[PDB]
């Protein structure tokens, strides 16, 4: 079973220290992967430039076009994939719009049927989504 001696504190502490690496949560914190190879170095949001738009296909059992775009980060140089939440915004969003990218809400995991996408766009041209949609704000003449 487990050691139960009064002088086995070192043995118990060492075994717990070795075994805690098997924990998925502890490993993801102690490896530093957020600052080592992750697209986001712990940042909640990051600015980027739109590269292109990709029509990803939904997985089973759904079937639709996800209306995604590809965005190149300006502070890291890593090319990632972005998801536009609403409908009819890919026409408004053109190349080089200075978009803002954030997480999806699954702690960096793909949400729903969208394959291989982990980020979502929040602002376009520095004005914010759902503002130009309701015709409250307008895209600057850039």
């Amino acid at each position: 079973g487990k050691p139960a001696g009064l002088n086995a504190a070192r043995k118990l502490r060492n075994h717990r220290r070795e075994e805690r690496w098997a924990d998925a949560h502890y490993k993801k914190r102690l490896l530093g992967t957020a600052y080592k190879s992750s697209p986001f170095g712990g940042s909640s949001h990051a600015k980027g430039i739109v590269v292109e738009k990709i029509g990803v296909e939904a997985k089973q059992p759904n079937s639709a076009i996800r209306k995604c775009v590809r965005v190149q980060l300006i502070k890291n140089g890593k090319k990632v994939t972005a998801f536009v939440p609403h409908d009819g915004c890919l026409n408004f969003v053109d190349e080089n719009d200075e978009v803002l990218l954030s997480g999806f809400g699954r702690k960096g995991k793909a949400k729903g049927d969208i394959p291989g996408v982990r980020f979502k766009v929040v602002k376009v041209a520095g004005v914010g989504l759902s503002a130009l949609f309701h015709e409250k704000k307008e895209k600057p003449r850039a």
């Binding site: 738009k53 990709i54 029509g55 990803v56 296909e57 076009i65 209306k67 409908d87 009819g88 915004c89 890919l90 026409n91």
Partner: protein
């Protein structure tokens, strides 16, 4: 998909849907009056009960 993208058919229903104007309505109390109105419509002026329905937004 694969190497394709439908950037032209997006927002079809939103673009083609009819648009109507919101119905006009006078002012409505907000705050403690709203709490009193909810209290007054909850159980002291029961109109939708019997069977435990407790419906506040019945369908028509």
């Amino acid at each position: 998909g694969k190497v394709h993208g439908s950037l032209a058919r997006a927002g079809k229903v939103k673009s083609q849907t009819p648009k109507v104007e919101k119905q006009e309505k006078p002012k409505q109390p907000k705050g403690r009056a709203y709490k009193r109105l909810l209290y007054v419509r909850r159980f002291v002026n029961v109109t939708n009960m019997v069977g435990g329905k407790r419906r506040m937004n019945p369908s028509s």
